[PDB]
Design an enzyme around this catalytic site. Sequence first.
Site, short mmCIF file in Angstrom:
data_model
loop_
_atom_site.label_atom_id
_atom_site.label_comp_id
_atom_site.label_asym_id
_atom_site.label_seq_id
_atom_site.Cartn_x
_atom_site.Cartn_y
_atom_site.Cartn_z
N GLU A 132 0.81 -1.23 0.00
CA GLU A 132 0.00 0.00 0.00
C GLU A 132 0.84 1.28 0.00
O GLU A 132 0.56 2.22 0.74
CB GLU A 132 -0.96 0.00 1.19
CG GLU A 132 -2.26 -0.65 0.87
CD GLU A 132 -3.01 -1.11 2.10
OE1 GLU A 132 -2.98 -0.39 3.13
OE2 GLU A 132 -3.63 -2.20 2.03
N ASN A 173 2.27 -5.11 -3.32
CA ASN A 173 0.83 -5.33 -3.18
C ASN A 173 0.14 -3.98 -3.02
O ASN A 173 0.71 -3.05 -2.42
CB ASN A 173 0.56 -6.23 -1.96
CG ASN A 173 -0.86 -6.80 -1.92
OD1 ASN A 173 -1.35 -7.37 -2.90
ND2 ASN A 173 -1.50 -6.69 -0.75
N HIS A 211 -10.25 -5.53 -3.67
CA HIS A 211 -11.41 -5.26 -2.82
C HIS A 211 -12.38 -4.46 -3.68
O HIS A 211 -12.30 -3.23 -3.77
CB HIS A 211 -11.00 -4.53 -1.55
CG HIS A 211 -10.15 -5.34 -0.63
ND1 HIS A 211 -10.58 -6.53 -0.08
CD2 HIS A 211 -8.90 -5.13 -0.16
CE1 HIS A 211 -9.63 -7.01 0.70
NE2 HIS A 211 -8.60 -6.18 0.66
N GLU A 243 -6.15 -10.24 -2.18
CA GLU A 243 -7.12 -10.08 -1.11
C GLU A 243 -8.53 -9.95 -1.68
O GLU A 243 -9.29 -9.08 -1.29
CB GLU A 243 -6.77 -8.87 -0.23
CG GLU A 243 -5.28 -8.70 0.13
CD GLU A 243 -5.03 -7.66 1.21
OE1 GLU A 243 -6.03 -7.10 1.68
OE2 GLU A 243 -3.86 -7.38 1.58
N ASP A 245 -12.25 -9.83 -2.62
CA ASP A 245 -13.64 -9.95 -2.18
C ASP A 245 -14.48 -8.98 -3.00
O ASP A 245 -13.98 -7.93 -3.44
CB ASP A 245 -13.81 -9.70 -0.67
CG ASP A 245 -13.10 -8.44 -0.17
OD1 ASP A 245 -12.86 -7.51 -0.96
OD2 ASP A 245 -12.80 -8.38 1.05
#
Length: 307
Positions: A132, A173, A211, A243, A245
């Site tokens: 990040e 990432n 996400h 990650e 979702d």
Amino acid sequence: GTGNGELHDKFVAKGKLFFGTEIDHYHLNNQPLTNIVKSSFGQVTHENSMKWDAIEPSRGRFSWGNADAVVDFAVANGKMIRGHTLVWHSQLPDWVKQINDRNTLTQVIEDHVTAMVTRYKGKIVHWDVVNEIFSEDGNLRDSVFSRVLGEDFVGIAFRAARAADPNAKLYINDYNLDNANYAKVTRGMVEKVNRWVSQGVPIDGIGSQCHLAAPGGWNPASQVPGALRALAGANVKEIAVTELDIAGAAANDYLTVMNACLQIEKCVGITVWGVSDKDSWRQGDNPLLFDNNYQPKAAYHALVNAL
């Protein structure tokens, strides 16, 4: 004819490395949860117990127990492990934000990176070396790392990692890499990885957290196939979604992401960020493949049948 009938074995049969999920130590005594990890997923990521403040809460005080429990579980059951994460601005102890001498911060980073990567040496398929580090417009986000060292902490951390476990793929990432045209993809990740790969920094992979919003939101996964191809277009050997979702968990939407990775040579695997909606970090959006009773949802059957 291909493992059991479930997701990770069918996914791997098409030529990919893993379809994993996220867990942590506080899920190890949940048997519905741990059976699904055993039978349907092939890889795990720690949700919280490998972050800086849980690993090194005071300088040189390492607390390994929670991380080790997940790792032991993973290797006992033949699951791969993505290590998450070595250098991050979030959940970061107050003792590191104090150091502003470039040397000491560089030492602290190596110390931290070298302690983790050595302890788990040979057991870790990917490390998220930095997490990040981009602003939504593509420059380095503000943190003790980017303030004190500029972009230099990237090469400091990747080199310490590579030195400590030559077998692990070293990844960068980030979230919001979900549109090919978005600034964070073009001016952030792609541009700066190219520049850092040019300078001798051993970056093996780019991770896209994914996400994602429901249809019609800011980052729908209508657009992810083109973003992943945007990312897979940089001078790296591989990419992964790390990650994943999606609010709503639409069969069509999960299908879109899985097949996007399937069709991109450099994309080696997928991790959903949890087994069940009950335990998701955004439970309201209901964004995983298993419901509150650890029963497979529509998206899950859909992916298995597409495979």
